[PDB]
Design a protein around this ligand. Structure first.
Ligand SMILES: CCCCCCCCCCCCCCCCCC(=O)OC[C@H](COP(=O)(O)OCCN)OC(=O)CCCCCCCCCCCCCCCCC
Ligand SMILES: CCCCCCCCCCCCCCCCCC(=O)OC[C@H](COP(=O)(O)OCCN)OC(=O)CCCCCCCCCCCCCCCCC
Ligand SMILES: NC(=O)C1=CN([C@@H]2O[C@H](COP(=O)(O)OP(=O)(O)OC[C@H]3O[C@@H](n4cnc5c(N)ncnc54)[C@H](OP(=O)(O)O)[C@@H]3O)[C@@H](O)[C@H]2O)C=CC1
Ligand SMILES: *P(=O)(O)OCC(C)(C)[C@H](O)C(=O)NCCC(=O)NCCSC(=O)CCCCCCCCCCCCC
Ligand code: SF4
Ligand code: SF4
Ligand SMILES: [Zn+2]
Lengths: 441, 337, 115, 154, 185, 133, 117, 76, 242
């Protein structure tokens, strides 16, 4: 700090520790086809550093007011004719300071914020925050809550994929599958609005279990929906998987290698599309996942087509998990049985003194979370969704940082898109499955 | 200017100054605020946290005004000039009443005499009836009860009616106004204004509308401006030909006009105004004003009496005429010739 | 990796005060060279002399800094503000928010309320 | 000149009608102090405003002492703009953007170091310490050879 | 990439198949290419959708389904005697995640702990239900009503006069929702 | 609608009603009456209908608005209860303070709700009393 | 402030019932109330008048329990001592209780707070 | 919004566009879209249900149906 | 309604009653002791291979944190990317935490994943408003945007970073809003102005000021000190008696 005032030793930098490749075995000047003459500086005469700063490529603001932008993205594209030479995504247009607002909330008061990050995957966002606080609380949520959270975790996964896959098909030009799949999601938001009181922002999954217990007719209606959802997957499978216009719009598009996908912080289908077997629910089992059987779809070419085939398989695997949860649903409480953490039943709060004191303190002060920090990650429908929560030992978090899968994915946009045409950029926005509530936070 | 304003009726106003969330303590009513001038006075009053009543006629044309102020600040009242109750309902909570109601051309239900004399009569009689502190009525330049142009005569008689009923009237006489959406610079850059009776050689001292809204704001705070008469004109005199020269230099278009002899054009202009429903710019009296010339009547306060120094129209041609430059010359810098 | 944008400059530390001295002149030169180009990009109705006056004053507020590590944060901010302006990422309202077009005495401040 | 209000201090986008006149602002020439407030992006109002550095005293209403553990840094209420009543609902408006903020420090020195580096004016008050005295239950029942000065009631 | 330990059995893909190793007949491959076969199947699947019942309901004559737990606009409720249930504890003001509730209380003329102010900024609210969750006496509730769109934002600043009027009008559902949903709370 | 249904419903209700329904619902619906609002609104049910279409309302006013449905019936039309307000006991608790009349959404009218401060000001200034010199 | 629906604090009570309650006549005034239907405004009944039309629940026990009568729907269960010759009120709902030992004294008072019968 | 031709209308859907909503006390959020554009109807909820938005569109069409266009000119 | 022939009403099926429910009590921390020894050895091993830079390590439940000095960012992350026992080839995340009580305010916290070993690790370094940190964009393409977020939100330079500019805040924005001294609602706000026909910036006024209920925090400490769970293999020996 003080030494920085005058000149001192320069802080070492990645350029310093660069090493020269060995000339005996080095083959080729480019082992990657991403940099194989499909970027800037592949035309013209002089570079854009000197004497080239006076000219521009054809630059177009793709969004925010754009359908393929799916919302609030300002993707500044530099076009060589109809070809992309450089893509600069500009985000922060839905940045609302969620991570600073969480610091002036109790832990309960911050949970509805997580509903609004990936706002097609509300109950999954709730879960990653509920699992981080529960870890810092050092409590073990009951078995019925763990099975409700895994079942609504996969109902949420299907809801996200319906919005994600069919929005992506809509961008490429296929309109009808979007309409069919939005009746199914309209069906599934009844299950949300029946356990919570909201179609979208449930505020259901909370540190300690879930807010209320499921109503007595819900499991039968979920099973009734489950007996017909296979046919829904097959008829959307029937318009796209073999369609030759679908295959030639996605096969060979947005290709990322396995070793680059890890280096780009890719997770989920963006990673599994490249051939890596990786699922956070397989590698760090959370809730009731280690109690169910499901398969993990993995692609081999790392393109938009394999990512589409992996997501259409996860429809079938989510419906497979849901059936096992319906079958294995145990009895018991849905809230950890400690009123110092979770609110007591209204009956008990109106009947007994220690229940009233605990209800009063949990809704004014909040509960105190033992001091420490943690990184907690779950397999969100869009990838590894994580949270870094720092705890004071008080009732308000000192720091809440959300690790959003789509933030890590939109950053690798120029890496995989430079060299493709303008329609291929639309194809890559939808395969990469962005919601800018999580990107900007 | 201070944190305490004391009004003519003697009520004090303890103010908190800045922003749209603060307390300007003034309840104004601005008649004729959906026109061109009316927004600048309303924005000035509203964004400093004053309650502004906006009497309106057509609902969809008032909507840009609500953005000026916070919640509950800008109150819309639906009124008619010949609806005295709606006039009285609109000025009776107020400590200042702005009368900006005017029309250049006659209409099938309002003559220039009916909108100027009678409209002012009702507005001023309500100002007298409920004992409103301040009344800033906006007349025109060259207003004269002895005039022969209907515009300059009728706005000159309403001046005397207002004083006869409410002597503390601040009478404001602006020159022809320029600004955004002005009927001065935007008509000279337009293509409909091709007909003309003189050779665009009439002179006037054009004034920025932005500096006139500021002037009306300062008259509310300078209580000593009550009972006075203000001519608000610009720094230079120009003809319509000199102004049109600036416009051509800015838009890079070289507009042209068809001149007509007044005994010929004036009858036609009275037909177009009587047979078309929109403001055509053409009417018998607007041709008569076209042949008249502006005179700054002395013994009348000026911008200097508000401590304001108006800017020249030339400095504003680039800002307001740039939408009308052709694509080839659009990227060019301001003319500043 | 992804391409750095048109005016993207790698973040590097000033070697010595001579380095910082030459960079600050390079940054001031590059700003005042671009003032004619800022005016037509953002349709500034003021003349370029005013724009360059404001560039000078921004540099003058950091005139009396004798710390290399404070200058390099400052050379960072100007590089990003220059890159942001020249690529037209910001808009006219942002550029006009930069041009402003307190009481001068105790007694003036007292009489109006604090300021 | 001996802590004077400088009336030539430049204003920025954040100066309002409630911004105080500053005695001085950082410029980066000062010795041994990082001029964070010069490069932080905060307005100049943060260098015209004094903060209070203190350990909060125990509330009279409780015996718990956890809010007395640390050092707190607040921003002093200014004469105008801290609160005024909204004409519409009676809600309490404000123009002081520091009214809901406070910082917490482990030692008094840390609070001074942060305020010096940020360019705040700052006043410290020291905590009033409890005067210790032995308390004995048996004092309740001490023998009195003479007049009972009061009749204890337990 | 793959898990550490023995590599997954048969994780290495089989060697690529050549053009003359693909075991599809030329008549089938060429037929599928020229006859646009897979896309005729997709055309047909749309045809049988064309002869299926639509999903559409005729709003507002028909309404979609909402549950007892549904969270709509706020209402203040009364006991069977017409006494306000609200006692000014301020718990809902504290727990609000959006600070949309402003409460001022006093002792009433008869010495009762009652609110003098009760405002909900309906443009600050997030409709989470946390305020009705925390009520000790079931005063603040969210109605099943969602159709209350207004011309201005001043119409969305509810005072105690507007919220009691809401409870006075909606009490039969508010009671039927609490009845149906109470055991789960 | 489909030909078997539309002719079957048209036969039941009559041509005059068929054209009235083509004017408001735009559909051709037949069912049995379940009750009437305090506002005149008419409610029908037919379980032999497509899901979420088994209950519907015939709006009393021509300028029909969704906020013209009485509170208890608002739950029945929403499938939030199955017992209609005719047979529902909570519609019998006598509340003399309850609105006797129909209180709909009053926006876009002069009956639109106007908010206000329900509390007195917080600081009271001195009323000056200049004592005689 | 022309109609009674813009002056009376409540339909059942004309005057205010709190120290800080702004009178209706002082809050229905102003420009925001110049083209307004007063009877269309929310004008709820005063609970202070309603609760006091309840008759006293007479009891012989020293201590009464009130939970609001709703079971879980009511309020937290509390206990009211009835020993003072005065009508004892529940702090949550205002329901009046008296002890029969004061029946003769209360039926002698010139006025009371709740109907004794 | 400026680039949208007359006649034009604005529906504000949601607490965030109404008054900033859950992010009202943020450093980066406009406290209601009507600081930026004029607003014709406000829909409550976060989120308003699909039917609540339909109800606000039915308010706006009811406002169109009572909008006096040609009879307005006839009064002036 | 044309019901299917083999789909009975599922609600019409009787559920067998469930009465007394037994539930064992579990400390969720007990499952993490079977790898406590292993997480301490790995953290110790790194401490020995790279003693020039690694200051300390901590082990909480299943999370191992490595504390390093900022001048060692490149070599330490080079070691964690390329070593055979340290194939940490993703950066899950890069964030900062502000501790104004510390001279070095900012704690730079990186999170790494090793899909080869199914392992996670945390590395923490420190900086202040003038000390920069070596960028890791040369080893991790995915770290480009994370470091931009730290620079935007906290104001930490990353020397060597290509294209280090704002990523979250508005374009002309001044200030670092995740700093503790930055006020929650900021300093400015915007509106469209009728007189100027544009968006303008103004000093921040609020119709209702933010109500900080933090003073309602408990006067009593509610968590206590916790427990020590260090394994015996990483505690010093005790001198046995006599
Ligand atoms: C269709 C039914 C008849 C249409 C309306 C005819 C009644 C009428 O008054 O027409 C006269 C109309 C008056 O137009 P006016 O607005 O008074 O002139 C001011 C514009 N400079 O002038 C017109 O002719 C309007 C053009 C039609
Ligand atoms: C009558 C009943 C049908 C009525 C309805 C007609 C269908 C309407 C559908 C909508 C319009 C048609 C849309 C066309 C979509 C096909 C297309 O354009 O895709 C381009 C595709 C690319 O082909 P390419 O990449 O070069 O080769 C490998 C492809 N995997 O190119 C292709 O895939 C090839 C498409 C072949 C079309 C050629 C026309 C076929 C007619 C027979 C041609 C006769 C000559 C061949 C003789 C037979 C030889 C055995
Ligand atoms: N602008 C100029 O060059 C000059 C202007 N003036 C005077 O300045 C004032 C403001 O000027 P400016 O804003 O440009 O004028 P506009 O013509 O644009 O605005 C006039 C206003 O008067 C209202 N109005 C006109 N006739 C009637 C009527 N019969 N009943 C009710 N309201 C009516 C209009 O309402 P609505 O839109 O609903 O019709 C409008 O708001 C006017 O009085 C004008 O004569 C004088 C000298 C020069
Ligand atoms: P001579 O020996 O006098 O040298 C003069 C200088 C200035 C070099 C000094 O002697 C000196 O070394 N002083 C310390 C360095 C210094 O002055 N400042 C550090 C440079 S960074 C800086 O000042 C950034 C200023 C703000 C950003 C650039 C200005 C433009 C802003 C935007 C313009 C308009 C956009 C719309
Ligand atoms: S929590 Fe309920 S009872 Fe308590 S003050 Fe709020 S509304 Fe009234
Ligand atoms: S439901 Fe609305 S009023 Fe209740 S706590 Fe949530 S945001 Fe606040
Ligand atoms: Zn009771």
């Amino acid at each position: 700090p003080q030494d920085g005032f005058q000149g001192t030793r320069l802080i070492p930098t990645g350029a310093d520790f660069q090493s020269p490749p060995d000339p005996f075995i080095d083959e080729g000047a480019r082992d990657n086809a991403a940099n194989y003459g499909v970027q800037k500086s592949r035309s013209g005469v002089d570079e854009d550093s000197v004497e080239g700063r006076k000219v521009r490529h054809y630059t177009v603001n793709f969004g925010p007011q754009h359908p393929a932008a799916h919302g609030v993205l300002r993707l500044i594209l530099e076009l060589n004719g109809e070809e992309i030479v450089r893509a600069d995504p500009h985000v922060g247009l839905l940045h609302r300071g969620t991570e600073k607002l969480c610091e002036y909330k109790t832990y309960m008061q911050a949970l509805p914020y997580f509903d609004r990050l990936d706002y097609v995957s509300m109950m999954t966002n709730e879960q990653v925050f509920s699992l981080a606080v529960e870890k810092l609380l050092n409590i073990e949520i009951p078995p019925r809550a763990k099975f409700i959270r895994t079942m609504f975790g996969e109902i949420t996964r299907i809801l996200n994929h319906l919005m994600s896959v069919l929005s992506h098909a809509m961008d490429v030009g296929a309109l009808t599958p979007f309409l069919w799949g939005f009746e199914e999601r309209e069906k599934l938001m009844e299950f949300y609005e029946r356990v919570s009181g909201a179609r979208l922002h449930a505020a259901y999954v909370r540190p300690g279990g879930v807010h209320q217990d499921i109503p007595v007719g819900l499991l039968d209606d979920i099973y009734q929906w489950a007996t017909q959802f296979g046919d829904r997957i097959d008829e959307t499978e029937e318009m796209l998987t073999d369609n030759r216009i679908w295959i030639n719009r996605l096969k060979g598009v947005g290709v990322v290698s396995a070793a680059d996908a890890l280096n780009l912080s890719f997770t989920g289908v963006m990673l599994r599309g490249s051939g890596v077997p990786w699922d956070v629910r397989k590698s760090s089992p959370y809730d009731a996942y280690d109690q169910v059987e499901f398969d993990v779809p993995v692609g081999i070419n790392g393109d938009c087509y394999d990512r589409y085939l992996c997501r259409m398989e996860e429809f079938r695997q989510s419906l497979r998990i849901i059936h096992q949860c319906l079958n294995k649903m145990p009895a018991g409480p849905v809230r950890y049985e400690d009123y110092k953490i979770t609110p007591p039943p209204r009956a008990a709060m109106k009947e007994n003194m220690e229940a009233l004191i605990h209800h009063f303190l949990l809704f004014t002060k909040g509960y105190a979370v033992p001091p420490g920090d943690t990184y907690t990650a779950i397999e969100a429908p869009k990838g590894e969704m994580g949270v870094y929560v720092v705890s004071d030992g008080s009732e308000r978090p000192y720091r809440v940082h959300i690790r959003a899968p789509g933030f890590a994915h939109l950053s690798g946009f120029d890496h995989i898109t430079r060299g493709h045409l303008l329609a291929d950029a639309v194809a890559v926005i939808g395969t990469m499955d962005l919601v800018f509530g999580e990107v900007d936070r | 200017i201070s944190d305490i304003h004391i009004t003519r009726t003697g009520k004090p106003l303890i103010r908190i100054q800045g922003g749209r969330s603060s307390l300007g303590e003034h309840t104004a009513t601005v008649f004729g605020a959906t026109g061109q001038l009316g927004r600048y006075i309303v924005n000035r009053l509203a964004r400093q946290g004053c309650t502004v009543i906006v009497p309106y006629r057509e609902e969809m044309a008032k909507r840009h005004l609500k953005v000026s102020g916070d919640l509950g600040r800008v109150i819309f009242m639906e009124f008619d000039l010949r609806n005295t109750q709606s006039i009285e309902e609109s000025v009776r909570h107020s400590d200042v009443v702005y009368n900006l109601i005017g029309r250049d051309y006659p209409t099938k239900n309002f003559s220039l005499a009916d909108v100027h004399i009678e409209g002012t009569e009702r507005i001023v009689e309500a100002v007298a009836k409920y004992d409103v502190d301040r009344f800033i009525q906006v007349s025109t330049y060259n207003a004269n009860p002895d005039s022969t142009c209907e515009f300059f005569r009728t706005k000159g008689i309403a001046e005397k009616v207002a004083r006869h009923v409410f002597p503390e009237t601040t009478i404001v006489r602006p020159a022809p106004m320029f600004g955004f959406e002005d009927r001065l610079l935007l008509k000279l850059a337009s293509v409909t204004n091709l007909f003309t009776s003189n050779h665009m050689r009439e002179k006037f001292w054009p004034v920025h509308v932005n500096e006139v809204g500021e002037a009306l704001e300062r008259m509310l705070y300078d209580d000593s401006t009550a009972g006075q008469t203000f001519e608000l004109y610009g720094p230079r005199q120009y003809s319509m030909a000199q102004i049109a020269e600036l416009v051509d230099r800015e838009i890079y278009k070289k507009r042209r006009h068809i001149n007509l002899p007044k005994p010929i054009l004036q009858p036609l202009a009275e037909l177009i105004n009587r047979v078309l429903w929109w403001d055509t710019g053409l009417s018998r009296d607007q041709v008569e004003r076209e042949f008249h010339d502006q005179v700054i009547d002395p013994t009348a306060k000026t911008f200097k009496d508000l401590g304001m120094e108006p800017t020249d129209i030339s400095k504003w041609t680039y800002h307001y005429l740039l939408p009308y430059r052709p694509s080839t010359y659009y990227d060019l810098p301001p003319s500043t010739e | 990796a992804v391409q750095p944008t048109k005016f993207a400059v790698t973040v590097r530390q000033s070697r010595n005060w001579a380095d910082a001295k030459q960079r600050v002149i390079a940054a001031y030169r590059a700003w005042i060279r671009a003032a004619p180009e800022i005016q037509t990009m953002y349709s500034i109705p003021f003349p370029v002399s005013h724009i360059r006056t404001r560039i000078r004053q921004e540099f003058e507020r950091h005139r009396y800094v004798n710390k290399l590590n404070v200058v390099d944060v400052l050379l960072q901010q100007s590089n990003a503000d220059f890159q942001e302006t020249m690529n037209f990422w910001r808009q006219q309202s942002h550029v006009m928010a930069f041009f402003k077009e307190l009481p001068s005495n105790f007694i003036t401040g007292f009489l109006e309320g604090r300021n | 000149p001996r802590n004077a209000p400088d009336y030539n201090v430049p204003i920025d986008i954040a100066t309002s009608t409630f911004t105080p006149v500053p005695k001085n602002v950082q410029d980066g020439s000062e010795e041994n102090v990082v001029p964070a407030g010069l490069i932080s992006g905060a307005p100049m109002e943060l260098q015209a405003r004094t903060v209070r550095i203190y350990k909060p005293a125990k509330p009279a209403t409780q015996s718990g002492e956890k809010n007395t553990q640390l050092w707190r840094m607040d921003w002093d209420v200014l004469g105008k703009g801290h609160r005024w009543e909204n004409p519409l609902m009676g809600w309490q408006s404000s123009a002081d953007f520091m009214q809901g903020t406070h910082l917490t420090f482990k030692t008094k020195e840390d609070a001074i170091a942060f305020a010096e580096k940020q360019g705040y004016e700052y006043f410290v008050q020291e905590p009033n310490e409890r005067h210790f005295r032995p308390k004995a239950y048996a004092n309740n029942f001490l023998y009195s050879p003479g007049k009972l000065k009061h009749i204890r009631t337990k | 990439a793959t898990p550490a330990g023995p590599p997954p059995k048969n994780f290495r893909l089989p060697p690529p198949k050549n053009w003359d190793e693909e075991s599809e007949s030329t008549i089938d491959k060429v037929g599928k290419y020229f006859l646009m076969t897979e896309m005729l199947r997709g055309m047909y699947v749309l045809l049988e959708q064309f002869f299926r019942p639509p999903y559409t309901i005729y709003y507002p004559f028909e309404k979609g389904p909402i549950s007892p737990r549904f969270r709509g606009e706020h209402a203040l409720r009364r006991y069977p005697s017409g006494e306000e249930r609200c006692i000014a504890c301020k718990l809902c003001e504290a727990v609000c995640p959006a600070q949309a509730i402003t409460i001022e209380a006093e002792e009433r003329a008869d010495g009762s702990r009652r609110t003098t102010r009760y405002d909900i900024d309906m443009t600050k609210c997030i409709y989470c239900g946390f305020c009705q969750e925390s009520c000790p006496v079931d005063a603040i509730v969210e109605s099943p009503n969602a159709e209350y769109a207004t011309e201005t934002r001043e119409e969305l600043l509810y005072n105690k006069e507007k919220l009691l009027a809401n409870g006075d009008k909606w009490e039969p559902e508010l009671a039927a929702a609490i009845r149906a949903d109470a055991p789960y709370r | 609608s489909y030909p078997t249904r539309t002719l079957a419903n048209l036969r039941k209700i009559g041509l005059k009603e068929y054209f009235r329904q083509l004017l408001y619902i735009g559909d051709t619906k037949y069912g049995e009456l379940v009750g009437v609002d305090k506002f005149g609104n008419k409610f029908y049910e037919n379980k032999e209908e497509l899901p979420l279409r088994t209950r519907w309302v015939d709006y009393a006013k021509h300028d029909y608005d969704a906020a013209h449905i009485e509170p208890m019936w608002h739950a029945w039309i929403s499938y939030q209860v199955d017992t209609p307000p005719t047979r529902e006991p909570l519609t019998q608790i006598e509340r003399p303070w309850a609105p006797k009349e129909h209180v709909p959404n009053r926006s876009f009218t002069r009956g639109a709700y106007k908010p206000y401060n329900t509390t007195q000001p917080k600081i009271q200034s001195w009323e000056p009393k200049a004592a005689p010199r | 402030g022309r109609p009674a629906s813009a002056v009376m604090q409540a339909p059942n009570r004309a005057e205010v019932w709190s120290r800080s309650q702004r009178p209706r006549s002082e809050a229905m005034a102003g420009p925001r109330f110049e083209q307004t239907d007063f009877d269309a405004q929310p004008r709820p009944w005063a609970a202070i008048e309603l609760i006091h039309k309840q008759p006293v629940r007479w009891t012989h026990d020293r201590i009464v329990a009130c939970d609001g009568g709703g079971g879980p729907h009511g309020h937290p269960k509390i206990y009211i001592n009835t020993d003072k010759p005065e009508i004892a009120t529940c702090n949550y709902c205002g329901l009046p209780f008296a002890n029969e030992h004061h029946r003769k004294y209360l039926e002698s008072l010139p006025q009371t707070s709740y109907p004794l019968n | 919004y400026d680039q949208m031709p007359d006649p034009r209308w604005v529906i504000s859907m949601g607490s965030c566009a109404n008054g900033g909503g859950y992010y009202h006390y943020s450093y980066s959020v406009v406290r209601g879209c009507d600081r930026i554009v004029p607003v014709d109807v406000y829909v409550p909820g976060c989120p308003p249900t699909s039917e609540a938005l339909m109800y606000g569109i039915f308010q706006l069409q009811r406002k169109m149906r009572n909008t006096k266009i040609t009879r307005m000119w006839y009064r002036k | 309604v044309a019901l299917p022939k083999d789909a009975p009403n599922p609600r019409a099926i009787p559920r067998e009653p469930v009465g007394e429910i037994k539930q064992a009590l579990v400390n969720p921390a007990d499952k993490y002791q079977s790898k406590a020894d292993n997480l301490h050895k790995y953290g110790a091993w790194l401490m020995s291979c790279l003693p020039k830079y690694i200051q300390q390590f901590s082990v909480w439940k299943d999370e191992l944190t490595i504390y390093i000095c900022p001048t060692g960012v490149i070599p330490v992350f080079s070691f964690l990317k390329y070593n055979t026992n340290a194939e940490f080839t993703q950066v899950s995340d890069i964030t900062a935490v502000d501790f104004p009580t510390r001279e070095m305010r900012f704690e730079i916290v990186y999170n790494l994943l090793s899909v080869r070993h199914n392992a996670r690790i945390r590395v923490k370094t420190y900086a202040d408003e003038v000390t920069p940190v070596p960028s890791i964009t040369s080893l991790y393409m995915g770290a480009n945007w994370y470091e931009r977020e730290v620079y935007d939100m906290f104001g930490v330079l990353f020397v060597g970073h290509p294209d280090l500019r704002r990523i979250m805040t508005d374009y002309g924005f001044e200030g670092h809003p995740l700093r503790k001294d930055f006020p929650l609602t900021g300093y400015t706000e915007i509106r469209y102005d009728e007189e100027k026909k544009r968006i303008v910036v103004e000093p921040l006024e609020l119709t209702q000021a933010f109500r900080n209920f933090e003073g309602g925090s408990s006067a009593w400490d509610q968590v206590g000190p916790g427990i020590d769970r260090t394994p015996d293999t990483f505690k010093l020996p005790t001198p046995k008696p006599e």
